[PDB]
């Protein structure tokens, strides 16, 4: 039928795996960057474009 989720040995699913438990630095943009967010017009433009592509699909 299936697997019982609550029962003997469930603690196995709750352990720490140190090597998997933190983000790595590859791909990460950090840190001191002054990067700033969308303005309202940049946002509105993007959302306009996304409405568009949604229409085309």
């Amino acid at each position: 039928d299936g697997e019982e989720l609550i029962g003997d040995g469930m603690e196995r699913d709750y352990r720490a795996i140190p090597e998997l438990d933190a983000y790595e630095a590859e791909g990460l943009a950090l840190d001191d960057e002054d990067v700033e967010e969308l303005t309202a017009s940049q946002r509105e433009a993007a959302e306009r474009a996304m409405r568009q592509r949604d229409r085309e699909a």
Binding site: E19, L20, A22, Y23
Partner: peptide
């Protein structure tokens, strides 16, 4: 308090 592990998830996103 653990659900998904951080590293695998990061990898998946990238």
């Amino acid at each position: 308090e653990l659900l998904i592990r951080k590293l695998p998830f990061q990898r998946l996103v990238r």
